[PDB]
Design brief:
It is classed as immune system. By secondary structure, chain A is mostly beta strands. Chain A has no helices and 19 strands. The chains are: A mainly beta, B mainly beta. 8-methyl-8-azabicyclo[3.2.1]octan-3-yl phenylphosphonate sits at the interface of chains B and A.
Chain lengths: ~210, ~220
């Protein structure tokens, strides 16, 4: 299929320049009708940033125009967004998207990448177990910054009964999140349960076994 | 971020219909085609309707749109638990730039379900690092309103916990909630009984789950 993939999430300091790329697979970037970016501040709606058309002409959101550059790199088959002089009001999930042919109805979207603009610094999490006819068990992913973390169970084999909660921002300025799952109590002695934690901003991956 | 106005939320039971309105002005909706998107939690928007009333391939005819004047409407019939999501309208403005509504969350109504409650002591691994987090989980309840009270040696805790709630479950329409009580290690070791007491419409009286440190 056509797939779009934004570069990874992280942190940008205020006044500095946010730089994102979107790798396109399954379609030649130079053939696309337009490529662009939209963002979504946390708990809010969508906001268009800008687009670049097949011609090379760009159109940007007038409120952002002085700070935005969108360009295409045909050797990498990717397009980019640079947003200069950022502030906390630029904190958002950024999506890349494109309409590959002008006759298409649906654009192809990326998955979104959260960029946090903050004077705080990147910190990886600690992962602690929440040890267990039904038993609950989980992982506590504590003391990380910025968002997000992802959590899977058993390398994606275990999905039923999993609940990964929104993170909370502690008074320390660091996030904490829990992920839990409910399983049969009989399985505790025979089935291994591992939570797979990824904090892309700090490049921290941990696979934590949770023992009864 | 938003330009067009949508209600914050709509709700109905499975099998029922909801409509979601999107109100604009003569220079956006009044002059331009409206599109609608569904955003399941943690995913990108997905097109439901374009050119006011057309469905792209893959979208079933339970979704429909229309436009009248400076307003548009999305209809969803035959509601399923999978339709729990945020919905957005979009159009172009007088400069032919894309603009969005602020989103409407769709909640699916279901029967009352009491939470199952679990408490987790701090791990030895965390206590070795100097801190103690006690976690209380309220699993798969409905409706969303729930109250957790922490007690430490019968002292009601106020202000030293934080909680969060899942989006509505895509299969059974329930919520789950996690609450963390944080103490220092030194404080955790001064007290014995840690308790989470839960009040919910599904419970005829509050449920308490507790443990004694080190027992
Ligand atoms: P939406 O993301 O646009 C879709 C549907 C139609 C119109 C452009 C392209 C992608 N398709 C050809 C949209 C439309 C208007 C405002 C905001 C979003
Ligand atoms: Cl689309």
């Amino acid at each position: 299929q056509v797939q779009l993939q934004e570069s990874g999430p992280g942190l940008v300091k205020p006044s500095e320049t946010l730089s994102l790329t979107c790798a396109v697979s399954g379609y030649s970037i130079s053939s696309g009708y337009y490529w662009g970016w939209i963002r979504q501040p946390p708990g809010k709606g969508l906001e268009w940033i800008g687009s670049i058309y097949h011609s090379g002409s760009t159109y940007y959101n007038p409120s952002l125009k002085s700070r935005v550059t969108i360009s295409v790199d045909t050797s990498k088959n990717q397009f980019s967004l640079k947003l200069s002089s950022v502030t906390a009001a630029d904190t958002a999930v950024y999506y890349c998207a494109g309409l590959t042919q002008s006759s298409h109805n649906d654009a192809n979207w990326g998955q979104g990448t959260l960029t946090t603009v903050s004077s705080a610094s990147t910190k990886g999490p600690s992962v602690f177990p929440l040890a267990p006819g039904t038993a609950a068990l989980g992982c506590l992913v504590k003391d990380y910054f910025p968002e997000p973390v992802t959590v899977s169970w058993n390398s994606g084999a275990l999905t039923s009964g999993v609940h990964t909660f929104p993170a909370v921002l502690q008074s320390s300025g660091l996030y904490s999140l829990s992920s839990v799952v409910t399983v049969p109590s009989s399985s505790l002695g025979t089935q291994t349960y591992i939570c797979n934690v990824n904090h892309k901003p700090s490049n921290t991956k941990v696979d934590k076994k949770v023992e009864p | 971020q938003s330009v067009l106005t949508q209600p914050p939320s709509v709700s109905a039971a499975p099998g029922q219909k909801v409509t979601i309105s999107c109100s604009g002005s003569s220079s956006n909706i009044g002059n331009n085609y409206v599109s609608w998107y569904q955003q399941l939690p943690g995913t990108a928007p997905k097109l439901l309707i374009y050119d006011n009333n057309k469905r792209p391939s893959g979208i079933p005819d339970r979704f429909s749109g229309s436009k009248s004047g400076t307003s548009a409407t999305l209809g969803i019939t035959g509601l399923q638990t999978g339709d729990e999501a945020d919905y957005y309208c979009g159009t172009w403005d007088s400069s032919l730039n894309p603009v969005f509504g602020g989103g409407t969350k769709l909640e699916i109504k279901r029967t009352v379900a009491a939470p199952s409650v679990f408490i987790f002591p701090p791990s030895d691994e965390q206590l070795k690092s100097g801190t103690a987090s006690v976690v209380c989980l309220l699993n798969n309840f409905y409706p969303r309103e729930a109250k957790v009270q922490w007690k430490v040696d019968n002292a009601l805790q106020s202000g030293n916990s934080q909680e969060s709630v899942t989006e509505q479950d895509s299969k059974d329409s329930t919520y789950s909630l996690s609450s963390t009580l944080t103490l220092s290690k030194a404080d955790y070791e001064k007290h014995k009984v840690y308790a989470c007491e839960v009040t919910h419409q599904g419970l005829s009286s509050p449920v308490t789950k507790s443990f004694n440190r080190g027992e």
